[PDB]
Structure formats: C-alpha cells, structure tokens
Ligand binder design. Sequence first.
Ligand SMILES: O=P(O)(O)OC[C@H]1O[C@H](O)[C@H](O)[C@@H](O)[C@@H]1O
Lengths: 33, 603
Amino acid sequence: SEERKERWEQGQADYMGADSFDNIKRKLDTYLQ
Amino acid sequence: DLENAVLFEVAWEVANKVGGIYTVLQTKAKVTGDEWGDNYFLVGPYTEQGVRTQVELLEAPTPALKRTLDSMNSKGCKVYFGRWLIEGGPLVVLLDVGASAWALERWKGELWDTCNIGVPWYDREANDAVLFGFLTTWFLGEFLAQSEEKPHVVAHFHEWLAGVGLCLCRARRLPVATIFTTHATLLGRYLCAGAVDFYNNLENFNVDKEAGERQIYHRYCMERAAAHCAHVFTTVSQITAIEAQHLLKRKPDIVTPNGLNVKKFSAMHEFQNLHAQSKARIQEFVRGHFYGHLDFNLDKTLYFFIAGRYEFSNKGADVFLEALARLNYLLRVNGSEQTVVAFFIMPARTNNFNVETLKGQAVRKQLWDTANTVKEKFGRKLYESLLVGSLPDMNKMLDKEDFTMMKRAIFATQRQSFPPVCTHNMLDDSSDPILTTIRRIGLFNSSADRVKVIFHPEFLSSTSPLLPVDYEEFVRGCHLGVFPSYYEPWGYTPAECTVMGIPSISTNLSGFGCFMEEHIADPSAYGIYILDRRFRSLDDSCSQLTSFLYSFCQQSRRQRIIQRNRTERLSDLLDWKYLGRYYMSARHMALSKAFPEHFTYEP
Ligand SMILES: O=P(O)(O)OC[C@H]1O[C@H](O)[C@H](O)[C@@H](O)[C@@H]1O
C-alpha cells in the first residue's frame, strides 16, 4: 500500500492504475463539499 | 453582505514576478482593497530578491495576527509580514519556501494519507508547491484557532502551485470557504499542440491518460483535486470554462475575467494624440527599413500588430501569415494605393542585429542630416532675404554645392536588394517558424508587394539602436492589432490593445474574444473583430480573417478614427472596477455555500 507513494515518486504513478484520479476524487469526497 | 471578515489571496506569483498571474493581482489589489477593506491579505512565497523590490515589512495590526505569525515562527516556519509596494496597499504574507526541511518529508506522507497524491523528487516546483501548500493551511489553521469567534474565511487560490494547499484546508475541515481561480488550464497547454483539434476533442480527451503520457499527472491531479475542494470553482475565460467542464471536470461556478487598471487620461482623445506621435516614430522606422524602395505612400499605410510569447500555433501566427498572403492578392489585383506594414513583435533567441537594417536606419539619419545642412543653408539665405525685404528666389536658394550633396545622398540611398523581413540576425534562421512561412508565402518586402512583413526578433525597448519605442507606445502607433489564437486562456496581448484606442481582431477560442461576444452584442461595430476558430477549419479561419483585414483596409481615414474612439469605450469593460465584480460575486457565493448560517443565498 505504501508502495503507491513510492510509485508516485519518479513519475511511475499509474493514470488508470493504483494512482488513478477516480480514487482521489472519492477521497476528497470523504471531506464532503 | 457587509459582515467583517478576513480573506487570503493565495498564489505563487505573489511577490515573485514570474508569470502573468502577477500582473493580474498587481491591479486587482485596488478594487479588492475596499470591498473587504484592510481585512484582506495575500499569501505568497518569500524571495529575498522580491523583498528588495516589492515588499516592505510591517508589524501586525491585530494582536491575534501577532500570535499567528509568532506561533508559526516556532516549529521551523518563517513568515516575513510586510506591505506590497504596489498600489492598493496589499498586506502580504510571505512564507519562506526555503524552509523545506521541517515539513517537506513529514507532510508529503501526511499528504498521501489525505489526498493520496505523490510528488516526484525530480520536478523542482512540485516539492516547492506542496511546502507552500502546507504553510498556507498552517496560517489559515492558526488564524481560525487563535482568533476567538472567527468570521467566515475565504481562501482565494490561484494556479496549481497553490492548488495543493486548497485540499489541505478542506481536509482539516477548518471553517474556510474556498475559491480556485485557474488563469490557465495546466493539461490544456500540452493538449493544445500535442492533441489535434484540442477544442473539438475537449469532451473526448482521456483525462487521466493524456496527463500520464505528458509526465504531468501529479500537477494535473493537484489542480483537479483543487476544483473538487472549492465550493466555488472559477475560470478567467468562458472558453477556459468549457475546457474545465471536459478536462478539470468541474464547471466554473462563476467566470471572473482578469482586468487591467486603465491609465485614464485628462482628455478622452489623448490616446489619439499619442497615436499620431507614436505613428510618426514608426514612420521614422519604415522610412528607414526601406531606403530607395520607398515607392509606397506612408500616409496611406496601415500597421498591423501581433505580440506575445514565441508560439507559432498558440499565438496564431500561422493564421495571420497566410491571411496577409491573400491580402497581398486583394490589394494588388484591385487597383489600391493602400499599403500594409505588419509587425511581428515576438521575442526569440538572436545573436545580433542585421547590417542592412542598421545601415538603413543610419541612412535615414544621413538623409535627415543632409536635409538639415541644406535646410539651414536655405534658412540662412532666406533670413537674409526676408531681412533685406525680398521673398526667396526659390531656384538659386540651393547652390551647386547643395545639389551635389543631395544628388550624392540619393545615390547612396539606392539599394538593389529588397528591404529585409527580419530586423535582427537569427541563430536559427531556417528553423524559425515565422521566417520559414514568409519565404513560402512570397512576401520578401518587394515593390510589387502591397504587404511588407517586418519581424522584430526581440521585444521592443526605448533603449534600442533600431525602433527606439517601448511596447505600450508601439501598440498605440499601429492602426490595428491582429491576434488570431488557438490557446490564449485570457488574451492579455489583445486585452491591453482594447484598453488602448486600437481595435483588435480577437478569436472565439481566445478568452478575451469570448468575453466580448458575451458582454457587448455588436462585434465588428464596436471595433473588436471576433474570428470563428471553434466551428471552422484552419483554411476557413484564414479566409474569414482576410475579409476582416480587407474591411479595415477599405476603411477611410475618418471611419478609422470613429472605430478607434469606439474601442476606447470598451476600456471600462476590462477595468478592474468593472471586472472585479465577478470576483466579489465569487467570494459572496463561497461564503454562502460553506457557511449558509449567517450568509445570504445572494442569487
Ligand atoms: O490613423 P489614421 O487613420 O491614418 O489617421 C491619422 C490621424 O490620427 C489621429 O487621429 C491624429 O490626431 C490626427 O492628427 C491624424 O490625422
């Protein structure tokens, strides 16, 4: 799980993968607008 | 709503002078300096270079502010509170981005348990933006905590560089209303050239795939996360609002166009007095770039203006070059005396000037010196003729000595080479996109050509050996300012043109052109020609532009002046006093959504 943060470093972040923004949008949704 | 509240304007360009966002907040400070008064602040990065020029340090007025700085001062965060020296009296909160060690590692991991966005170590401003992001949330957090019964806060965030600190304020759940104003879409910039028909395919673009490919996903996520973290998402342009609707995936709640503080004069026609003064200084230049080839009338000549960063596709030089090639035809196949001298003022890498251009400018002063010597010789002979009591003979006035001076001056003037397309000498002349097109279309500044293209490979300056006139004066000199574009988030080059009396050809894809279509009903009548580039093709857009250019070419002396007076009336539309309303509306809207308990709907 902490693997993804390392993947972000060096731009190994996956656009459709683990690092996909759709998860990030739901994560922001936890702090509801 | 009149409630007393403290807001912060957060941007990277605050006391940095890096991008165009600096120029936005330069004159925004005056209009925002009375709407919220002295309560408003500007959170920005700290540079010691920027302090010496722009920042004057001052103590905190409120005791709660004194502690916010002091508590932040402990724990390794340093704030150099001061007042911006720009007009408006903006109190600036300069946080040191140099203080990276205390929170860069800890809060980067804290950022990942919260936003789940990671930062590559390779990208420099990426690590600097997040630091600045946590520092903002710290200041806002302390301000909410140490101020007992804190009024409803607005955090006004500009650019991706502040866009990280947007989500941190929301993540803490701190009582703060949030605004994100993207002056330019990050991914839109690379999508403009990399992906064909970017505006046509704005909906289709795979929004995550494209960012990953341009190795720019982390930056894209921070700006996109910011949209879902602002109760009010704001774009400068309505065309940028369409961009954000299909890329940032957040419809802008309000569109708050950037504005200028117009330098209003005492006479409402002083712009037109500054027209003729600057036109003459351009006339001194084209009477010299061309020597011995000055067959054209410069009193029936027009000057077209195009400026900005050296971007051939973005600043739409490709559209304007193929249009002048057709304007070459229409003013030559038709018996016209109208000559048009288009100026391409775009900065590019250049070792030195050109010998022919410098020689032509020197010859112009030579034919001014040889026209001052025999002028004084005429004058002295006249003064001893008027004093004697006789009107001048007018034939003997100039001796054989004078005639030989003038006859030799003309002989030196004569050139066989056609006057140059580029004023300076380039390192990469063949590789230069503008110069390659010029030789292709067939405009070598010839006698037969009714359009002469005069590229100036570097910015205009007043301290210049050739063309000694600054940009703000040079715009006022030119008759028309043509700005075709594909990716101008907000026209600043066509925007500043319309602030002055000079009419500007904007486009539908430009942010300024969409604003002029929305506000005023009349396009061409008020002066601002708007080019359809969204629902047309590259060739079609060139063809419309030709009809727009030829319309101005067929215009008379008097009709040109009326149009230039009409364009002056549109300066009120771009002024911060009028365009600040939109930002104010964003603020009022932000307060209500985040805190409806004492804030009205304000529909
Ligand atoms: O710019 P043009 O259409 O050639 O007109 C030239 C005119 O410009 C300004 O209005 C000046 O005040 C006039 O003195 C001049 O006659």
